[PDB]
Design a protein around this motif. Structure first.
Motif, short mmCIF file in Angstrom:
data_model
loop_
_atom_site.label_atom_id
_atom_site.label_comp_id
_atom_site.label_asym_id
_atom_site.label_seq_id
_atom_site.Cartn_x
_atom_site.Cartn_y
_atom_site.Cartn_z
N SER A 89 -2.55 12.59 3.34
CA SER A 89 -2.44 12.81 1.90
C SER A 89 -1.02 12.64 1.37
CB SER A 89 -2.95 14.21 1.55
OG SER A 89 -4.30 14.36 1.95
N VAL A 90 -0.91 11.93 0.25
CA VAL A 90 0.37 11.67 -0.38
C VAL A 90 0.36 12.11 -1.84
CG1 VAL A 90 2.10 9.90 -0.92
CG2 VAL A 90 0.63 9.64 1.09
N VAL A 91 1.38 12.86 -2.24
CA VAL A 91 1.50 13.31 -3.62
C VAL A 91 2.30 12.24 -4.37
CG1 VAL A 91 2.40 15.08 -5.17
CG2 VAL A 91 1.52 15.72 -2.91
N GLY A 92 1.70 11.63 -5.38
CA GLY A 92 2.40 10.59 -6.13
C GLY A 92 3.57 11.11 -6.95
N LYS A 143 0.84 -1.19 0.00
CA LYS A 143 0.00 0.00 0.00
C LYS A 143 0.88 1.25 0.00
CE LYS A 143 -3.81 2.42 0.25
NZ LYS A 143 -5.01 2.30 -0.63
N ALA A 144 1.94 1.23 0.79
CA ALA A 144 2.85 2.37 0.86
C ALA A 144 3.47 2.63 -0.51
CB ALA A 144 3.95 2.11 1.89
N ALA A 145 3.89 1.56 -1.18
CA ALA A 145 4.50 1.69 -2.50
C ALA A 145 3.50 2.25 -3.51
CB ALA A 145 5.02 0.33 -2.97
N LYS A 180 8.00 9.91 2.97
CA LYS A 180 7.65 10.07 4.38
C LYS A 180 6.14 10.02 4.58
CE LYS A 180 11.70 12.85 5.67
NZ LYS A 180 12.17 14.19 6.13
N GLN A 181 5.41 10.71 3.72
CA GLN A 181 3.95 10.75 3.82
C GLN A 181 3.32 9.37 3.63
OE1 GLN A 181 1.59 13.59 4.37
NE2 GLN A 181 3.56 14.06 5.36
N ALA A 182 3.85 8.61 2.68
CA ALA A 182 3.33 7.28 2.39
C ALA A 182 3.48 6.37 3.61
CB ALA A 182 4.07 6.68 1.20
N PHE A 183 4.66 6.37 4.22
CA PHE A 183 4.86 5.53 5.39
C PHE A 183 4.04 6.03 6.58
CE2 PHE A 183 8.48 3.93 2.94
CZ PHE A 183 8.39 2.57 3.23
#
Ligand code: CA
Ligand code: CA
Ligand code: CA
Ligand code: CA
Ligand code: ZN
Length: 316
Positions: free
Chosen positions: A254-257, A239-241, A307-310
């Protein structure tokens, strides 16, 4: 064997026609001499003795139903080799062009595929749960990536380190699927799973919870089954990836791809330079952040997204 390099033609598990590299010496063998020290595909003849016999064919045409699994195992191993060489400048799984070997028709109605420490092995499936496993490019790439991990980070196949090992194989299995542009998606094994049911898969990277796998560290499996849940907890990293590449808001974060190419570069560097046999999730985060820092700078959007993803999946 020693012979003349040539090109044959055949049909894969899904019925698609493709050209494959073979070697001629009385018979035409599934031996590709164009990649490293070669790619070899064997017939296990429904037995469990490995590797079996190097695949031999009389006319260099592989259109028989029995040939299908061999055609795809041979062809997709080649595509995966190309991916690692062209995208990451890595020659085969050991980095020194080691020969790649695969055996198909392993056992009877066997619903699994695996790397046994020396080669890849593919069952034919029972025809209900699975069809020949080599028919899925993400499956083949998943398996060859286990070989890459064994020669690099060496992540122990248990608990958190094992879950990372699994996620790495799913991540690169998916990146190879996108590289080949074969109906790419963020699902795992959809092409060979449950032929009687459309739209499903074995695992999902975009939404692991769809199949009951955890998508947050707070939901991690702490039992002893599946070597400490290596195929279960991998969902947290998958999911993080997915978030790093595609972006999105997960559990309010929120994560910016940043895209698939950068995801691959960051994880390949982490795998080959920072991870060790006993690395846990927290250490993977540190490794990923350091890798992104090396490549794009400490104040880059790339580092921020990692950092946001994790944070989104609860890995500190
Ligand atoms: Ca033939
Ligand atoms: Ca697909
Ligand atoms: Ca897939
Ligand atoms: Ca299905
Ligand atoms: Zn695996």
């Amino acid at each position: 064997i020693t012979g003349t390099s040539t090109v044959g033609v055949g049909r894969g598990v899904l019925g698609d026609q493709k050209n494959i590299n073979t070697t001629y010496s009385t018979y035409y063998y599934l031996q590709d001499n164009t990649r490293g020290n070669g790619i070899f595909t064997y017939d296990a003849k429904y037995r469990t003795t490995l590797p079996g016999s190097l695949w031999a064919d009389a006319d260099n045409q592989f259109f028989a139903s029995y040939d299908a699994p061999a055609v795809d195992a041979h062809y997709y191993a080649g595509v995966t080799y190309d991916y690692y060489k062209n995208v990451h400048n890595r020659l085969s799984y050991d980095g020194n062009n080691a020969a790649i070997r695969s055996s198909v028709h392993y056992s009877q109605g066997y619903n699994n595929a695996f790397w046994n420490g020396s080669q890849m092995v593919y069952g034919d499936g029972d025809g209900q749960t699975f069809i020949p496993l080599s028919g899925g490019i993400d499956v083949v790439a998943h398996e060859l990536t286990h070989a890459v991990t064994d020669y690099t980070a060496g992540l122990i196949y248990q608990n958190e380190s094992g879950a990372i090992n699994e996620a790495i194989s799913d991540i690169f299995g998916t990146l190879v699927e996108f590289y080949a542009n074969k109906n790419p998606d963020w699902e795992i094994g959809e092409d060979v799973y449950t032929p009687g049911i459309s739209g499903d898969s074995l695992r999902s990277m975009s939404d692991p919870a769809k199949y009951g796998d955890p998508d947050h560290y707070s939901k991690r499996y702490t039992g002893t089954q599946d070597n400490g849940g290596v195929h279960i907890n991998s969902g947290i990293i998958n999911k993080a990836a997915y978030l790093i590449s595609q972006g999105g808001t997960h559990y309010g974060v929120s994560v910016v791809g940043i895209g698939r190419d950068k995801l691959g570069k960051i994880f390949y560097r982490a795998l080959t330079q920072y991870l060790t046999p006993t690395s846990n999730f927290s250490q993977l985060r540190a490794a990923a952040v350091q890798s992104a820092t090396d490549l794009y700078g400490s104040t880059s959007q790339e580092v921020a997204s990692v950092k946001q993803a994790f944070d989104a999946v609860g890995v500190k």
